[PDB]
Amino acid sequence: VSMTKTSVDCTMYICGDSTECSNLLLQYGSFCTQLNRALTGIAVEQDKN
Amino acid sequence: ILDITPCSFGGVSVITPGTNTSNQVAVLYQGVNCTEVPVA
Numbered sequence A: 001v002s003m004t005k006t007s008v009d010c011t012m013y014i015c016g017d018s019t020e021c022s023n024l025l026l027q028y029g030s031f032c033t034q035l036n037r038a039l040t041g042i043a044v045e046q047d048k049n
Numbered sequence B: 001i002l003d004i005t006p007c008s009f010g011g012v013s014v015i016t017p018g019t020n021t022s023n024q025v026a027v028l029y030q031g032v033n034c035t036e037v038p039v040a
């Protein structure tokens, strides 16, 4: 009926606590948030389901 | 020998009844013990 709600921080998974690699990721920008919306969208529908 | 435990992080989720109704809010720090809050 459901599967485990996983939440991922893409800004952290790509690199943990490096401000540097984070400052570079801002040049791609939107892709991090686009996945956060998606993983929220999977996670919320486990309650619905 | 030392065990390294990378520092406590987690989701910040904010709770709001009616922002329209009120400007008060409450917070959830997802997956972190309370010890790590008055400490932090």
Ligand SMILES: *[C@@H]1O[C@H](CO)[C@@H](O[C@@H]2O[C@H](CO)[C@@H](O)[C@H](O)[C@H]2NC(C)=O)[C@H](O)[C@H]1NC(C)=O
Residues within 6 Å of the ligand: B033, B034, B035
């Ligand atoms: C939050 O962490 C504290 C430790 O900082 C936990 O308290 C420990 O609980 C065990 C089991 O009763 C005791 O043996 C220890 O003496 C406690 N430590 C201290 C410093 O009091 C507490 O259980 C944790 N809470 C949650 C919800 O995980």
Ligand SMILES: *[C@@H]1O[C@H](CO)[C@@H](O)[C@H](O)[C@H]1NC(C)=O
Residues within 6 Å of the ligand: B018, B020, B021, B022
């Ligand atoms: C919420 O907005 C409506 C207008 O659409 C207003 O009538 C209502 O009083 C507002 N709620 C609160 C708690 O003020």
